[PDB]
Amino acid sequence: SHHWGYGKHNGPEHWHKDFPIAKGERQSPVDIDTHTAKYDPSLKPLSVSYDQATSLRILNNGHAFNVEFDDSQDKAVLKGGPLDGTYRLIQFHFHWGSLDGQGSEHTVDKKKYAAELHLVHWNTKYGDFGKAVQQPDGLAVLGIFLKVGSAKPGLQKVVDVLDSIKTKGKSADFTNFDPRGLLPESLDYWTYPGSLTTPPLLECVTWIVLKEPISVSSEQVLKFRKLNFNGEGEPEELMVDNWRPAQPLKNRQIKASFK
Numbered sequence: 001s002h003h004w005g006y007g008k009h010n011g012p013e014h015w016h017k018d019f020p021i022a023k024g025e026r027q028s029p030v031d032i033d034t035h036t037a038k039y040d041p042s043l044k045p046l047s048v049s050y051d052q053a054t055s056l057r058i059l060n061n062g063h064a065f066n067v068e069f070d071d072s073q074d075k076a077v078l079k080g081g082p083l084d085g086t087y088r089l090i091q092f093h094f095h096w097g098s099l100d101g102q103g104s105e106h107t108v109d110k111k112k113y114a115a116e117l118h119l120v121h122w123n124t125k126y127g128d129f130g131k132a133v134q135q136p137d138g139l140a141v142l143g144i145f146l147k148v149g150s151a152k153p154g155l156q157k158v159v160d161v162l163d164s165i166k167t168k169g170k171s172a173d174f175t176n177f178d179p180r181g182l183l184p185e186s187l188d189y190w191t192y193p194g195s196l197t198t199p200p201l202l203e204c205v206t207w208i209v210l211k212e213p214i215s216v217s218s219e220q221v222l223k224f225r226k227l228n229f230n231g232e233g234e235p236e237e238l239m240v241d242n243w244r245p246a247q248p249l250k251n252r253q254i255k256a257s258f259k
């Protein structure tokens with residue numbers, strides 16, 4: 001190791017040495033076995049209210065690129081589904097692969113997608129993000145798979161700014177981006193209790209993974225693979241394969257909102 005990453009020497013199989021919770025009882029991602037997920041008719045439809053979303057900035061943090069939102073008020077929230085209370089969007093980011101046949105963190109019946117989008121929200125009852133991650137119901141992550149096919153118009157503004165945040169630590173102003181353009185048509189989902197997928201790997205997440213993938217074009221995903229893990233003036237290491245493999249389900253049940 002040294003600092004964690006996705007390489008041979010500091011990749012997911014090493015994390016447990018600095019972050020023992022890596023071998024925990026509620027680690028993510030998982031494989032979603034569709035024939036073993038339990039339909040639960042008591043789950044409510046999700047409620048995504050992103051019409052007042054305020055994006056602020058896009059940042060290359062060395063492991064992905066995050067688009068950050070103003071979370072000082074209830075502007076872009078998620079509620080409903082399996083959640084109690086209101087969760088505010090704080091940031092979204094992707095995980096992707098070096099090839100189109102891999103890239104997602106969750107799998108479906110062992111199927112891997114080209115990428116996976118995570119919309120990260122935190123439970124307002126805890127007052128701030130940093131307090132939320134210390135609680136079992138502190139975050140709610142919506143995960144959306146991407147397959148390669150048609151271009152997604154609403155992703156192009158993201159794609160286009162990537163050249164300006166090529167290396168670790170770079171940021172760019174990124175206002176007026178509407179995350180509604182990244183949702184599939186259907187909001188049917190699976191849900192289970194899990195964790196963050198990067199260190200510190202805290203088990204504070206209710207995952208909501210959407211059944212329906214979105215399509216992106218090959219060119220679009222190609223632009224993701226041009227980013228760098230390294231900082232400026234360091235030897236170039238392309239930012240690819242920044243996904244953690246599926247972890248054991250252990251004593252958990254995946255619930256479906258649909259049949």
Ligand SMILES: [Hg+2]
Pocket residue numbers: 133134135136138202203204205
């Ligand atoms: Hg936690």
Ligand SMILES: [Zn+2]
Pocket residue numbers: 093094095118197
């Ligand atoms: Zn993620």
